[PDB]
Ligand binder design. Sequence first.
Ligand code: NAG
Ligand code: NAG
Ligand code: NAG
Length: 434
Amino acid sequence: QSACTLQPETHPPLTWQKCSSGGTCTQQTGSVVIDANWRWIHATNSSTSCYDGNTWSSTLCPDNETCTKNCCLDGAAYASTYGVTTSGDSLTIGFVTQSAQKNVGARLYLMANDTTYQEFTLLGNEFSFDVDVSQLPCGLNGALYFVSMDADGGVSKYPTNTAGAKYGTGYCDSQCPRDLKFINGQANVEGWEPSTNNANTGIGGHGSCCSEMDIWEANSISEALTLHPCTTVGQEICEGDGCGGTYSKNRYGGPCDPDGCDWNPYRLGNTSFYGPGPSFTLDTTKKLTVVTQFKPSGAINRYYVQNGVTFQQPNAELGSYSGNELNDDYCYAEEAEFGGSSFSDKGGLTQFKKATSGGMVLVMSLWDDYYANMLWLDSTYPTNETSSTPGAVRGSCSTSSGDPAQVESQFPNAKVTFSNIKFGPIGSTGNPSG
Ligand SMILES: *[C@@H]1O[C@H](CO)[C@@H](O)[C@H](O)[C@H]1NC(C)=O
Ligand SMILES: *[C@@H]1O[C@H](CO)[C@@H](O)[C@H](O)[C@H]1NC(C)=O
Ligand SMILES: *[C@@H]1O[C@H](CO)[C@@H](O)[C@H](O)[C@H]1NC(C)=O
């Protein structure tokens, strides 16, 4: 895509802290940018839309190539259109923002500068953030995660992408998403079909795959961390059934693991660790700190901080596994007890370590789920089962919760706040903020 400038693009600022093992942290000045899919796409030389509702212009976008020629991405009014605002080290995303049109949620990337996403090498380092999920009911997900995107959002690889990271291009994840309007410098017009239940979205012929580290998939009721390896580490186009994921004859037919090896303390049998009010170890009505450590072996350690108390990830027992570190033994035991071989089939932690050894881009988002009502996160899934099937219960939300129309209507003012991001060698982020 090219970029037009009826709405000049200025990214909201966000400070964060970079820490050293020698005991110090110092302030970094970043900023956030909204993903291309949330942007107005119009004719390069007028206000006529190329994409409107959930379908492309037949006159302007007959094929991928003509569409990319005729059309452009424009800038975002972050606060007034998208309900995205920042203050110091704090970022808030509103759920439903009503302007001239209704906007639902957002997906944002942390930038190093105006034209470059911030790349983090996670392996051997730790990532800490604060989060307030108190305004997130069943069905919502304030996600913080990492994907193997290119720093320039694909500019050096695709001559017809001139918008780049400045306009939030280059998204990929382990779902190999086909709902993207631009992939690899080109419009996803060919094979586009409008969603049957979403007035604003659809599915194209092509998708965009890469490695995904889900640090935080969470609302006030449930939280999970999930690792998704792919056979090609970085961003790659896929076509149709080649994409696997949600849309394909074979969910598992693509280069990525869509399921992931997950750790949800509730799903694992600890139902008093995380929830709203004083009866939980972590009280979700209040801000909490989440720290994630990437052991050089490829294992993962997790701790939390609330009201100045440090809580380890609760010990879990599963098959032959016992402990609180996400390692090879945990992920094998999870498949053994809960079923599936997707994670292992795609190379497991060894493959995933290839992603964490390179750069990954930080993503912060807020969404509802038009495919599965977020039930896989916070409820019983699939819904025909009870807690008799191991792994089926992931949270205490009713199986009739999370319908998008319902939550968009009842909780339009829901929101997530991410703040106080800190990154450095393992053991370093507890150091005094700069
Ligand atoms: C932003 O960072 C990129 C990536 O190295 C660099 O090439 C570019 O010159 C930078 N822009 C500015 C204004 O510093
Ligand atoms: C669009 O179509 C062309 C040629 O048919 C294809 O090579 C390209 O990868 C497609 N791009 C997208 C984003 O779907
Ligand atoms: C849940 O985790 C908390 C905090 O670590 C712990 O005190 C408690 O014993 C755990 N409960 C179960 C059922 O394992």
